[PDB]
Design a protein around this motif. Sequence first.
Motif, PDB file in Angstrom:
ATOM      1  N   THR A 175     -40.493  33.125 -42.836  1.00  0.00           N
ATOM      2  CA  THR A 175     -41.747  32.481 -43.207  1.00  0.00           C
ATOM      3  C   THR A 175     -42.282  33.035 -44.522  1.00  0.00           C
ATOM      4  OG1 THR A 175     -43.128  34.052 -41.959  1.00  0.00           O
ATOM      5  CG2 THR A 175     -42.336  32.095 -40.787  1.00  0.00           C
ATOM      6  N   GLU A 176     -43.483  32.605 -44.896  1.00  0.00           N
ATOM      7  CA  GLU A 176     -44.106  33.060 -46.133  1.00  0.00           C
ATOM      8  C   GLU A 176     -44.702  34.454 -45.962  1.00  0.00           C
ATOM      9  OE1 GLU A 176     -47.060  30.516 -48.030  1.00  0.00           O
ATOM     10  OE2 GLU A 176     -45.468  29.080 -48.510  1.00  0.00           O
ATOM     11  N   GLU A 177     -45.232  34.723 -44.772  1.00  0.00           N
ATOM     12  CA  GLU A 177     -45.836  36.017 -44.481  1.00  0.00           C
ATOM     13  C   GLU A 177     -44.766  37.052 -44.142  1.00  0.00           C
ATOM     14  OE1 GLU A 177     -49.646  35.916 -41.973  1.00  0.00           O
ATOM     15  OE2 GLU A 177     -49.960  36.838 -43.942  1.00  0.00           O
ATOM     16  N   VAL A 190     -42.136  41.823 -50.263  1.00  0.00           N
ATOM     17  CA  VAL A 190     -42.305  40.659 -51.124  1.00  0.00           C
ATOM     18  C   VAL A 190     -43.714  40.089 -51.008  1.00  0.00           C
ATOM     19  CG1 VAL A 190     -41.196  38.543 -51.914  1.00  0.00           C
ATOM     20  CG2 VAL A 190     -39.925  40.160 -50.485  1.00  0.00           C
ATOM     21  N   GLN A 191     -44.694  40.842 -51.498  1.00  0.00           N
ATOM     22  CA  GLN A 191     -46.086  40.412 -51.448  1.00  0.00           C
ATOM     23  C   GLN A 191     -46.522  39.822 -52.786  1.00  0.00           C
ATOM     24  OE1 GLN A 191     -48.460  42.318 -48.660  1.00  0.00           O
ATOM     25  NE2 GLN A 191     -47.443  44.317 -48.783  1.00  0.00           N
ATOM     26  N   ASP A 192     -45.585  39.183 -53.478  1.00  0.00           N
ATOM     27  CA  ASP A 192     -45.872  38.573 -54.771  1.00  0.00           C
ATOM     28  C   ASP A 192     -45.821  37.051 -54.677  1.00  0.00           C
ATOM     29  OD1 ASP A 192     -46.495  40.623 -56.604  1.00  0.00           O
ATOM     30  OD2 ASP A 192     -45.115  39.764 -58.084  1.00  0.00           O
ATOM     31  N   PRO A 193     -46.599  36.379 -55.537  1.00  0.00           N
ATOM     32  CA  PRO A 193     -46.661  34.915 -55.571  1.00  0.00           C
ATOM     33  C   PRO A 193     -45.373  34.292 -56.098  1.00  0.00           C
ATOM     34  CG  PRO A 193     -47.896  35.833 -57.402  1.00  0.00           C
ATOM     35  CD  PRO A 193     -47.479  36.995 -56.545  1.00  0.00           C
ATOM     36  N   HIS A 213     -42.597  35.726 -56.229  1.00  0.00           N
ATOM     37  CA  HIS A 213     -41.502  36.202 -55.391  1.00  0.00           C
ATOM     38  C   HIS A 213     -41.476  35.459 -54.059  1.00  0.00           C
ATOM     39  CE1 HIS A 213     -41.772  40.305 -57.682  1.00  0.00           C
ATOM     40  NE2 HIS A 213     -41.324  39.315 -58.434  1.00  0.00           N
ATOM     41  N   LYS A 214     -42.656  35.106 -53.561  1.00  0.00           N
ATOM     42  CA  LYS A 214     -42.770  34.392 -52.295  1.00  0.00           C
ATOM     43  C   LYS A 214     -42.345  32.935 -52.452  1.00  0.00           C
ATOM     44  CE  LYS A 214     -46.803  34.896 -50.291  1.00  0.00           C
ATOM     45  NZ  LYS A 214     -47.865  35.772 -49.724  1.00  0.00           N
ATOM     46  N   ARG A 215     -42.664  32.352 -53.602  1.00  0.00           N
ATOM     47  CA  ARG A 215     -42.315  30.963 -53.878  1.00  0.00           C
ATOM     48  C   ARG A 215     -40.844  30.839 -54.262  1.00  0.00           C
ATOM     49  NH1 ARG A 215     -43.183  25.749 -52.589  1.00  0.00           N
ATOM     50  NH2 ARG A 215     -44.133  24.535 -54.290  1.00  0.00           N
ATOM     51  N   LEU A 216     -40.253  31.949 -54.687  1.00  0.00           N
ATOM     52  CA  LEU A 216     -38.849  31.965 -55.087  1.00  0.00           C
ATOM     53  C   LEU A 216     -37.936  31.873 -53.868  1.00  0.00           C
ATOM     54  CD1 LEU A 216     -36.766  32.075 -57.216  1.00  0.00           C
ATOM     55  CD2 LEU A 216     -39.009  32.517 -58.231  1.00  0.00           C
ATOM     56  N   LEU A 217     -38.153  32.761 -52.904  1.00  0.00           N
ATOM     57  CA  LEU A 217     -37.351  32.778 -51.686  1.00  0.00           C
ATOM     58  C   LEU A 217     -37.317  31.398 -51.036  1.00  0.00           C
ATOM     59  CD1 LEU A 217     -37.642  36.297 -50.645  1.00  0.00           C
ATOM     60  CD2 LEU A 217     -36.582  34.890 -48.870  1.00  0.00           C
ATOM     61  N   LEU A 218     -38.494  30.824 -50.816  1.00  0.00           N
ATOM     62  CA  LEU A 218     -38.599  29.505 -50.204  1.00  0.00           C
ATOM     63  C   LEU A 218     -37.704  28.499 -50.920  1.00  0.00           C
ATOM     64  CD1 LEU A 218     -41.274  30.882 -49.076  1.00  0.00           C
ATOM     65  CD2 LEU A 218     -42.161  28.546 -48.962  1.00  0.00           C
ATOM     66  N   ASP A 219     -37.688  28.569 -52.246  1.00  0.00           N
ATOM     67  CA  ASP A 219     -36.873  27.667 -53.051  1.00  0.00           C
ATOM     68  C   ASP A 219     -35.393  28.023 -52.935  1.00  0.00           C
ATOM     69  OD1 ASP A 219     -38.257  25.561 -54.840  1.00  0.00           O
ATOM     70  OD2 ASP A 219     -36.444  26.056 -55.980  1.00  0.00           O
ATOM     71  N   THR A 220     -35.111  29.315 -52.792  1.00  0.00           N
ATOM     72  CA  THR A 220     -33.737  29.788 -52.674  1.00  0.00           C
ATOM     73  C   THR A 220     -33.144  29.422 -51.318  1.00  0.00           C
ATOM     74  OG1 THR A 220     -34.560  31.733 -53.888  1.00  0.00           O
ATOM     75  CG2 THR A 220     -32.236  31.734 -53.232  1.00  0.00           C
ATOM     76  N   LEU A 221     -34.013  29.111 -50.362  1.00  0.00           N
ATOM     77  CA  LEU A 221     -33.575  28.742 -49.020  1.00  0.00           C
ATOM     78  C   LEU A 221     -32.874  27.387 -49.031  1.00  0.00           C
ATOM     79  CD1 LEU A 221     -36.404  29.890 -46.580  1.00  0.00           C
ATOM     80  CD2 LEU A 221     -34.257  31.005 -47.215  1.00  0.00           C
ATOM     81  N   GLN A 222     -33.589  26.359 -49.477  1.00  0.00           N
ATOM     82  CA  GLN A 222     -33.034  25.013 -49.539  1.00  0.00           C
ATOM     83  C   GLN A 222     -31.908  24.935 -50.563  1.00  0.00           C
ATOM     84  OE1 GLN A 222     -36.235  22.091 -49.869  1.00  0.00           O
ATOM     85  NE2 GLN A 222     -36.906  22.782 -47.839  1.00  0.00           N
ATOM     86  N   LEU A 223     -31.947  25.827 -51.546  1.00  0.00           N
ATOM     87  CA  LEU A 223     -30.929  25.860 -52.592  1.00  0.00           C
ATOM     88  C   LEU A 223     -29.552  26.145 -52.002  1.00  0.00           C
ATOM     89  CD1 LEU A 223     -31.196  25.920 -55.936  1.00  0.00           C
ATOM     90  CD2 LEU A 223     -30.332  28.236 -55.551  1.00  0.00           C
ATOM     91  N   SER A 224     -29.401  27.326 -51.409  1.00  0.00           N
ATOM     92  CA  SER A 224     -28.133  27.722 -50.805  1.00  0.00           C
ATOM     93  C   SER A 224     -28.179  27.561 -49.289  1.00  0.00           C
ATOM     94  CB  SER A 224     -27.805  29.172 -51.167  1.00  0.00           C
ATOM     95  OG  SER A 224     -26.557  29.261 -51.831  1.00  0.00           O
ATOM     96  N   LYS A 225     -29.024  26.647 -48.823  1.00  0.00           N
ATOM     97  CA  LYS A 225     -29.164  26.392 -47.394  1.00  0.00           C
ATOM     98  C   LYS A 225     -29.456  27.684 -46.637  1.00  0.00           C
ATOM     99  CE  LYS A 225     -27.285  22.445 -44.922  1.00  0.00           C
ATOM    100  NZ  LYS A 225     -28.495  22.214 -44.085  1.00  0.00           N
TER     101      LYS A 225
END
Length: 65
Positions: A39-41, A48-51, A53-65
Amino acid sequence: SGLGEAGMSAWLRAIGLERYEEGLVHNGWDDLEFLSDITEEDLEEAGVQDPAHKRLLLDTLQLSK
């Protein structure tokens, strides 16, 4: 019983944030399978308490599934 020695290593390389790898690997995210539901939290739990950095992971999820 372990032919990889990376897991989410090269995964974080697609976004250039592998620096946080150990941050989530030492928390219970080493499994790319489970991290796919992170999740985001949950990111802040690994440090990873950065903006950006938090928005990056989420994007990296759908990227490499």
